Amino acid sequence: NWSVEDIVKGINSNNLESQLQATQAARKLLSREKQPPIDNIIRAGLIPKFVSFLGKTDCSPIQFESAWALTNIASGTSEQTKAVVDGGAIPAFISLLASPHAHISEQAVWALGNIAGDGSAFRDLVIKHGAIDPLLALLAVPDLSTLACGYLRNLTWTLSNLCRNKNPAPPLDAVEQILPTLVRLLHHNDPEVLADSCWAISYLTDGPNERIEMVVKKGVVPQLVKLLGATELPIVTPALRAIGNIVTGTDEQTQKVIDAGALAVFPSLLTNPKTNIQKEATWTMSNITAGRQDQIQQVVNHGLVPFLVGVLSKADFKTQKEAAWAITNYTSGGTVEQIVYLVHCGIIEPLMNLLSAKDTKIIQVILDAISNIFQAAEKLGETEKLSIMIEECGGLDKIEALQRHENESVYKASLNLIEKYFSV
């Protein structure tokens, strides 16, 4: 509607009502779907004026309009977000969290979410300015259901950004301060609150075992497993990420996931029509089969080996690569009986067919698993029985062709295989 030129004229008028009308006009310009003129507004020098309007407690309308305008500037590129921070906006927005007007405090929540979402530095800067205490105070009600639903979703999303990003991860004391509120939100019945809570938990568990432990010790794994079975893709996706993260930790952290019943949802996850769900579920499997023999046994007992055979047989190639890793981890740590069971489920033929892949890493992984299965066969005396199985499905052709392959590890291992199990 208005031109930037006219907005500037109104803002510079030193007439509060004229300034309000011009700030609202800026807000509407910045709120249009078609390429908002953010850089034009910044170049006109308006950010410092918007920031000063955030402090006009006597004129809450101009606080709201300035907050909205600045929110949308901070929603753009890093350099645009930086312009808002450089104008002094962080402490001004934190001051607005205590506004008696819900729509104004909500806009400050939103703006701080955008600023913290830029990256690690601005996230930690929002924290150093003291955003966490007043953010959490807005949620200190006995039942979250009494809060307005849009208000609650905005607070959850902003808290999730305070949990987001690495190098560095969020300060340990900030995480520990936020976590109990996060756990409340993870048990709330709104699907958008649930999704962003799950995302927050997935960020917190994307790191070293000490960070996983701080989440797992709050008892959220059962709720994560429940959400793993949700019908809403926007909930299953972060729930699976968080579960996947947790099983990259210690065998005891992985056991909590198994204890909570996660493996029973993997028949559905490993056949999920959404390829990134299948991929992440198979990746998660590969870190469970890297565990203890008793954890491999629970994978067996839940009937999941046929599902791994399936994904190896037919899936998106990235998923098939995760399955190859799941099998190599299984054969690396499993008992002889567990490895025998894997052959009886049909692993050999799909394993052999993937030796035709161009990818050099997957060849080594598959060759490594064939090795581990042969070592199981040696312990039993059936090395030749296995060599005919690999022969019958056209496998021997592939290991044979592979000793003349560019890779050192591929040529060495494939030749070692030919020499030890396919000779006179």
Binding site: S31, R32, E33, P36, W68, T71, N72, A74, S75, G76, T81, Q107, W110, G113, N114, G117, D118, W157, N161, R164, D196, W199, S202, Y203
Partner: peptide
Amino acid sequence: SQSPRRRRSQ
């Protein structure tokens, strides 16, 4: 991961 930034188009 989801979008770190949200514009209010309202």
